[PDB]
Design an enzyme around this catalytic site. Structure first.
Site, PDB file in Angstrom:
ATOM      1  CD  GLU A 104      -3.226  -1.046   1.729  1.00 17.29           C
ATOM      2  OE1 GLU A 104      -3.231  -0.823   2.963  1.00 17.29           O
ATOM      3  OE2 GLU A 104      -4.231  -1.146   1.030  1.00 17.29           O
ATOM      4  CG  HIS A 117      -1.205  -2.665   7.323  1.00 17.00           C
ATOM      5  ND1 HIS A 117      -2.176  -2.380   6.375  1.00 17.00           N
ATOM      6  CD2 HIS A 117      -0.026  -2.142   6.903  1.00 17.00           C
ATOM      7  CE1 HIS A 117      -1.577  -1.620   5.463  1.00 17.00           C
ATOM      8  NE2 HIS A 117      -0.276  -1.461   5.746  1.00 17.00           N
TER       9      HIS A 117
HETATM   10  N1  WJN Z   1      -5.436  -1.475   6.434  1.00 15.59           N
HETATM   11  S1  WJN Z   1      -5.447  -0.711   7.789  1.00 15.59           S
HETATM   12  O1  WJN Z   1      -4.386  -1.186   8.649  1.00 15.59           O
HETATM   13  O2  WJN Z   1      -5.523   0.698   7.569  1.00 15.59           O
HETATM   14  C1  WJN Z   1      -6.914  -1.104   8.627  1.00 15.59           C
HETATM   15  C2  WJN Z   1      -8.149  -1.139   8.042  1.00 15.59           C
HETATM   16  C3  WJN Z   1      -9.317  -1.490   8.764  1.00 15.59           C
HETATM   17  C4  WJN Z   1      -9.169  -1.833  10.095  1.00 15.59           C
HETATM   18  N2  WJN Z   1     -10.352  -2.204  10.806  1.00 15.59           N
HETATM   19  C5  WJN Z   1     -10.331  -3.040  11.980  1.00 15.59           C
HETATM   20  O3  WJN Z   1      -9.393  -3.538  12.546  1.00 15.59           O
HETATM   21  N3  WJN Z   1     -11.664  -3.235  12.404  1.00 15.59           N
HETATM   22  C6  WJN Z   1     -12.052  -3.862  13.606  1.00 15.59           C
HETATM   23  C7  WJN Z   1     -11.188  -4.384  14.543  1.00 15.59           C
HETATM   24  C8  WJN Z   1     -11.686  -4.901  15.699  1.00 15.59           C
HETATM   25  C9  WJN Z   1     -13.032  -4.869  16.018  1.00 15.59           C
HETATM   26  C10 WJN Z   1     -13.595  -5.420  17.381  1.00 15.59           C
HETATM   27  F1  WJN Z   1     -13.608  -6.746  17.453  1.00 15.59           F
HETATM   28  F2  WJN Z   1     -12.964  -5.022  18.462  1.00 15.59           F
HETATM   29  F3  WJN Z   1     -14.871  -4.996  17.379  1.00 15.59           F
HETATM   30  C11 WJN Z   1     -13.893  -4.288  15.079  1.00 15.59           C
HETATM   31  C12 WJN Z   1     -13.381  -3.791  13.902  1.00 15.59           C
HETATM   32  C13 WJN Z   1      -7.966  -1.817  10.679  1.00 15.59           C
HETATM   33  C14 WJN Z   1      -6.882  -1.487   9.980  1.00 15.59           C
HETATM   34 ZN    ZN Z   2      -4.109  -2.893   6.176  1.00 16.39          ZN
END
Ligand code: WJN
Ligand code: ZN
Length: 258
Positions: A104, A117
């Site tokens: 990315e 990531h």
């Molecule tokens: N590619 S990046 O690193 O920018 C990136 C993109 C999306 C996310 N989203 C999550 O981790 N979402 C998520 C985690 C955890 C929970 C939980 F279980 F706690 F509800 C609910 C949702 C993280 C990182």
């Molecule tokens: Zn990511």
């Protein structure tokens, strides 16, 4: 809701459902190494993963996530640009169809084969869902992957992928040590950005390590055997699940190193 990485639902379409896609602090970005400036103000980076407790691995239709128990300060990231304590919640990768693409972030426009990531949330906000609503809610540690020698500490991940081929499948994934995914050096670049997938929230302090890890062609080939689709749906290989570089706008990338 029907976003993805194809021609019809890919990054060029995301702005229609997620207008912040065209915002002022979107990720990823190109890291121009000549323009990034060494910052003496940066404190030492502290990766404390000795007590990390992995739980599960899930194919979510976009990538696969290795999830951690984040109910206490077990695996944390501190220091560097960060104020306070950020807990590890999950890691995942983005990768290409070919070894020349997949990352990315880029470095002087160079694309790596993949990017890891490691996602952490700021404990001052109590839970992940609250943290993503805050400009300093998340810290993502990004690590480039190049194809060469195998990464021994990745092999446990590679070997479970057969059991999570399709969207919605998960498997137990206990006792995995994320320390085995790190390079030797913690030198890094940092800048304020966003999630790189919908909802594209502008909540991330990005910390991108300068030193890539090496993985084997065989390791990355196994990532490319995953599927974006659910079981019993037409097969669509999970490849090229990366967002391209976005406009830097009014940001400066800082380096931890001379
Ligand atoms: N590619 S990046 O690193 O920018 C990136 C993109 C999306 C996310 N989203 C999550 O981790 N979402 C998520 C985690 C955890 C929970 C939980 F279980 F706690 F509800 C609910 C949702 C993280 C990182
Ligand atoms: Zn990511």
């Amino acid at each position: 809701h029907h976003w993805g990485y194809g021609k019809h639902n890919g990054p060029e379409h995301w702005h229609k459902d997620f207008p912040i896609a065209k915002g002022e602090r979107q990720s990823p970005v190109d890291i121009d190494t000549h323009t990034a400036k060494y910052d003496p103000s940066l404190k030492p980076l502290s990766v404390s993963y000795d007590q990390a407790t992995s739980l599960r691995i899930l194919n979510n239709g976009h990538a696969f996530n290795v999830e951690f128990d984040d109910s206490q300060d077990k695996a944390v990231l501190k220091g560097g640009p960060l104020d306070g304590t950020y807990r590890l919640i999950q890691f995942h990768f983005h990768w290409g169809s070919l070894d020349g693409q997949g990352s990315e972030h880029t470095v002087d426009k160079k694309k790596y084969a993949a990017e890891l990531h490691l996602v952490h949330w700021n404990t001052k906000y109590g839970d992940f869902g609250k943290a993503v609503q805050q400009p300093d809610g998340l810290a993502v540690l990004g690590i480039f992957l190049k194809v060469g020698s195998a990464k021994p500490g990745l092999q446990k991940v590679v070997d479970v992928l057969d059991s999570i081929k399709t969207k919605g499948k998960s498997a137990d994934f206990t006792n995995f040590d994320p320390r085995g995914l790190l390079p030797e050096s913690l030198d890094y670049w940092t800048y304020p950005g966003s999630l790189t997938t919908p909802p594209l929230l502008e909540c991330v302090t990005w910390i991108v390590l300068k030193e890539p890890i090496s993985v084997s062609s065989e390791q990355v080939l196994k990532f490319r055997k995953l599927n974006f689709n659910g079981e019993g749906e037409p097969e669509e290989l999970m490849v090229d699940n990366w967002r391209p570089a976005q406009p830097l706008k009014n940001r400066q990338i800082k380096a931890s190193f001379k």
